[model samples]
Target: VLKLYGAPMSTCTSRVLTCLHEKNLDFELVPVDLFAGEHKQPPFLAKNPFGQIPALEEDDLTLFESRAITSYIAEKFKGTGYDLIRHENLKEAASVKVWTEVESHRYNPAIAPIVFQFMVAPLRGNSPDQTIIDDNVEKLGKVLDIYEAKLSSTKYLAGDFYSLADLHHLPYTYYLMKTPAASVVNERPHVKAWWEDISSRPAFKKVAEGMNF
Candidate 1:
């Protein structure tokens, strides 16, 4: 049985949830209860020393790191839902790997800060950090620029078919869209269309219900 320990609204946690839904897997989401400081306690620290969300316990093994968990899910449940990794095609798989890395390094790093500034900071009674938003917004715009060009050529990041690269984007992008910075995506025709396409997926639609600040 699959048991996922995570918060329902966490970006990292949602990433794994979306993959599980896509594969039509039945799993229990054991909320880590971050507000009560459950994650840093010894009981959870034994699962993930870094104290991050979305750790998966699969009877045979325990795993942490959101993207790594999704990768395992995609491999373990291959052909059950979307062919997220494209392992059957070498070049296609290469493209998936490249873009998946891009999501983690290029896209996520740039957007996460901005989303936090707009969505999380204010909720926590702190003023939005203009400095952080300004710096990250510039970088996010540049990343989206490259995305607009690439998306103009391919339906999805890895190619015409949906893959992990595309699914990985849903969480952060979903939050970003609600902020003023949404124009970053809406302004770029290709990028906007690409977001709409990926966000509209049935699996993501279900997972999105729990995605909140």
Candidate 2:
């Protein structure tokens, strides 16, 4: 079985867990306390030199970065569940890659700061910066506008089917839902419907039930 190292509440870790659930893979979770600075230590660094949590360890194999791990899991377990990669067609695969990149480049940047400030800062004994939160909310809203238009035409981000593109956005967006900025999704009918569709998946539901931050 695979061994996962990270905190359950971590956005990155939650993403991996969701992928694991979607793939129907079994794994062992080893908690790495961020508050305790355990991730920066030698033991964890051996798995991820960047000192990041949510490293995957399997025998001699070690993997870091949540997205990369999810890709591996999805590809490795393809056909066992919902065909997330869509590898049957060249264009469909390319389209999935495009939307995945959009999430990483456009969506992640616009929303990460807002999530960090509003959701994470308090956990570290610091108050959220109102200016930062407001600024990023504007940025995220603009991004969501594009998503609204795109989703209006299709049920999911990478075409009509639920793909990795849609799955990749869940973790950060899950936390984003708790903030006032959630209006970005709720206010746009298409985006709101998309959120409801993807987030309500049984796999995502299981991950969210056990998630904490």
Candidate 3:
């Protein structure tokens, strides 16, 4: 079985877990305590030189970066019927890559700060930054506008079928939806419907069950 070293509540770790479950892959989650700085220690550092949460270990194989790991799992287990990356068709695969990058570059940057401020900050005894939240809401809304238009046509981000582009979005947006920031999604009809569709999947549902902060 594969081993995943990461915290249950971590965004990146949750991202990988969702893909693993979607592909029907059974694996072990070897929890790493981020709050205690365990990720920076020598043993964990050896797995991922950057000391990030979620290093995949299977026998002598080691992989880091949540997206890369998901890519590997999607490719290795393509026969599982998940078809996340759409590697079968060149054009479909290109669409997946585009929106996956959009999630990383456009969507995540806008919403992560809201989640950090609304959820993680108060727990650390720091006040939530309303300025950051407000600014990001504006930024995220602009991105969502584009998503609204895109999703208006297709059932998923990459096309009519589900793909990694949609899965890549769940972790951050899952946390984002719990806060007032949810209005950003709820305000747009297509975007709201799109989120409801993707997040309700059985695979992502299991991932969310373990995301309690």
Each model's lDDT: 0.91, 0.89, 0.91
Candidate 2, residue 202: Cα displacement in angstroms equals: 0.2
Whole-model lDDT, model 2: 0.89
TM-scores of all models? 0.96, 0.96, 0.96
> Per-residue lDDT of 110-142 in model 3, one digit per residue for the tens?
888889998889979999999999999999999
Best by lDDT: 3
Give stretches of model 2 more than 4 Å off.
none
Q: Which lDDT value does model 1 have at 139?
A: 96
- Model 3 deviation from native, Cα RMSD in Å: 1.2
Clashing pairs in model 1?
A: none
**Poorest 10 consecutive residues by lDDT, candidate 2:** 204-213
lDDT of 1 by residue, 1-213 (tens): 999999878888999999999888999999898878899899899999998787999997999999999999999888677778886898999999999999999999999999888877976899999999989989999999999999989898889889999999999899899988899999999999999989999999888889843
- Candidate achieving higher lDDT, 2 or 3: 3
